[PDB]
Design an enzyme around this catalytic site. Sequence first.
Site, PDB file in Angstrom:
ATOM      1  N   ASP A 207      78.310  14.963  62.151  1.00 24.90           N
ATOM      2  CA  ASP A 207      77.542  15.070  60.916  1.00 24.90           C
ATOM      3  C   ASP A 207      77.835  16.390  60.195  1.00 24.90           C
ATOM      4  O   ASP A 207      77.937  17.437  60.820  1.00 24.90           O
ATOM      5  CB  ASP A 207      76.037  14.954  61.212  1.00 24.90           C
ATOM      6  CG  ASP A 207      75.266  14.375  60.043  1.00 24.90           C
ATOM      7  OD1 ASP A 207      75.913  14.086  59.018  1.00 24.90           O
ATOM      8  OD2 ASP A 207      74.031  14.208  60.145  1.00 24.90           O
TER       9      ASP A 207
ATOM     10  N   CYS B 160      77.030   6.050  56.730  1.00 26.82           N
ATOM     11  CA  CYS B 160      76.998   7.065  57.759  1.00 26.82           C
ATOM     12  C   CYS B 160      75.473   7.217  57.925  1.00 26.82           C
ATOM     13  O   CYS B 160      74.788   6.197  58.014  1.00 26.82           O
ATOM     14  CB  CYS B 160      77.714   8.360  57.300  1.00 26.82           C
ATOM     15  SG  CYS B 160      77.419   8.891  55.580  1.00 26.82           S
TER      16      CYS B 160
ATOM     17  N   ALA C 165      73.139   9.253  55.849  1.00 25.56           N
ATOM     18  CA  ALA C 165      72.596   9.258  54.477  1.00 25.56           C
ATOM     19  C   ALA C 165      73.491   8.436  53.528  1.00 25.56           C
ATOM     20  O   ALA C 165      73.105   8.095  52.403  1.00 25.56           O
ATOM     21  CB  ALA C 165      72.513  10.702  53.953  1.00 25.56           C
ATOM     22  N   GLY C 166      74.693   8.124  53.977  1.00 21.74           N
ATOM     23  CA  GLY C 166      75.592   7.367  53.127  1.00 21.74           C
ATOM     24  C   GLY C 166      76.198   8.203  52.008  1.00 21.74           C
ATOM     25  O   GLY C 166      76.494   7.676  50.941  1.00 21.74           O
TER      26      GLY C 166
ATOM     27  N   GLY D  66      77.843  12.014  52.789  1.00 21.77           N
ATOM     28  CA  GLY D  66      78.823  12.997  53.251  1.00 21.77           C
ATOM     29  C   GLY D  66      80.091  12.344  53.806  1.00 21.77           C
ATOM     30  O   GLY D  66      81.158  12.370  53.187  1.00 21.77           O
ATOM     31  N   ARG D  67      79.966  11.751  54.986  1.00 22.77           N
ATOM     32  CA  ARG D  67      81.095  11.082  55.634  1.00 22.77           C
ATOM     33  C   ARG D  67      81.555   9.871  54.829  1.00 22.77           C
ATOM     34  O   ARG D  67      82.752   9.721  54.577  1.00 22.77           O
ATOM     35  CB  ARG D  67      80.709  10.708  57.065  1.00 22.77           C
ATOM     36  CG  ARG D  67      80.556  11.968  57.931  1.00 22.77           C
ATOM     37  CD  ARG D  67      79.952  11.725  59.308  1.00 22.77           C
ATOM     38  NE  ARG D  67      78.485  11.582  59.274  1.00 22.77           N
ATOM     39  CZ  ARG D  67      77.745  11.352  60.360  1.00 22.77           C
ATOM     40  NH1 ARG D  67      78.334  11.240  61.546  1.00 22.77           N
ATOM     41  NH2 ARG D  67      76.421  11.230  60.271  1.00 22.77           N
ATOM     42  N   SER D  68      80.608   9.031  54.394  1.00 22.19           N
ATOM     43  CA  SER D  68      80.938   7.862  53.579  1.00 22.19           C
ATOM     44  C   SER D  68      81.717   8.271  52.314  1.00 22.19           C
ATOM     45  O   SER D  68      82.675   7.602  51.922  1.00 22.19           O
ATOM     46  CB  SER D  68      79.654   7.120  53.152  1.00 22.19           C
ATOM     47  OG  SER D  68      78.981   6.580  54.280  1.00 22.19           O
TER      48      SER D  68
ATOM     49  N   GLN E  42      79.671  16.209  51.380  1.00 21.89           N
ATOM     50  CA  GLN E  42      78.596  17.178  51.592  1.00 21.89           C
ATOM     51  C   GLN E  42      78.927  18.613  51.967  1.00 21.89           C
ATOM     52  O   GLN E  42      78.018  19.423  52.038  1.00 21.89           O
ATOM     53  CB  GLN E  42      77.598  16.609  52.610  1.00 21.89           C
ATOM     54  CG  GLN E  42      76.658  15.558  51.990  1.00 21.89           C
ATOM     55  CD  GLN E  42      75.535  16.196  51.195  1.00 21.89           C
ATOM     56  OE1 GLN E  42      74.655  16.814  51.774  1.00 21.89           O
ATOM     57  NE2 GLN E  42      75.566  16.064  49.864  1.00 21.89           N
TER      58      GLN E  42
END
Length: 296
Positions: free
Chosen positions: A179, A213, A215-216, A218-220, A260
């Site tokens: 994360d 991910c 929160a949908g 950062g990674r997404s 993010q």
Amino acid sequence: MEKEFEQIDKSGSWAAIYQDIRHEASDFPCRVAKLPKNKNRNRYRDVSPFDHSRIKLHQEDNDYINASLIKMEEAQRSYILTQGPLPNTCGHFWEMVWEQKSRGVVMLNRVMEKGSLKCAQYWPQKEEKEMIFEDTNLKLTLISEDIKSYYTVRQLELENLTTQETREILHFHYTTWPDFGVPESPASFLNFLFKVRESGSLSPEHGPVVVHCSAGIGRSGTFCLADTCLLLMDKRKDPSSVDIKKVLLEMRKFRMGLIQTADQLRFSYLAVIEGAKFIMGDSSVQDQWKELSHED
Ligand SMILES: O=C1C[C@@H](c2ccc(C[C@H](NS(=O)(=O)c3cccc(F)c3)C3=NC(Cc4ccccc4F)=C=N3)cc2)S(=O)(=O)N1
Ligand SMILES: [Mg+2]
């Protein structure tokens, strides 16, 4: 593209550049997301879908789900970015997958990360224990799974209990992307992305792939930006023309906070620069990526 990268590195300006993007990012209302009746449908109070791009569930009662349609016009690809489902929104998640006709679901987080729940267990871990989402009248069964060192691909069967229609849904689960962090390497990231691409899941014949991910965002967002930029490079007559910062601002018109950290932005540059090699022809880079990813 690597010239700009090299000069950002030398100047040490990733943070300033990333903050410029945050400052220039679109600000649209999220009134439906903020209605009192939708509070328990949101995992995080500060991460909401914009009203104009939100995915509407086809149910009359309450059509709200924390999910956004990212429609990239020039690249000709749409993605639905959503938060990791909550215990009470797993039915809604699959109802969305059904109504939007998605064929693939890309998960970039784990259910529990560093002692904290980040997402509900929304799919069956065992073949013999299927799941029924009563509120949405859907049945979900784990058909099989191909477990790799840092990711797992699963075959799920989603059935509309009402009509008896069944659909095979592919689940691409990246298990080692921390994360607020980045993948082990551009190679590991790209190996996974091309697995999704090669599966046919991203095809325009199907509905938008659902990416999430915790929160949908950062990674997404990192995943979608790299995929979109590679698509634009292959499209245009001059790949050097792709401005990753412009593409990210374009994506941020559809969902807030995509990417993010300054380092996920820097990682996106590396991912695109590395992947470009395959787009320009190199037929030895893919195997290279697989070897480098140690997926076995
Ligand atoms: O790499 C990533 C980051 C994860 C992630 C991003 C954002 C959040 C939302 C958090 N909300 S909160 O109610 O726990 C929380 C935690 C600390 C401070 C605060 F005001 C609220 C979160 N917000 C900020 C980030 C942030 C800041 C402004 C606007 C929107 C935002 F998402 C940092 N984490 C959670 C996970 S991801 O699953 O999107 N992938
Ligand atoms: Mg078993």
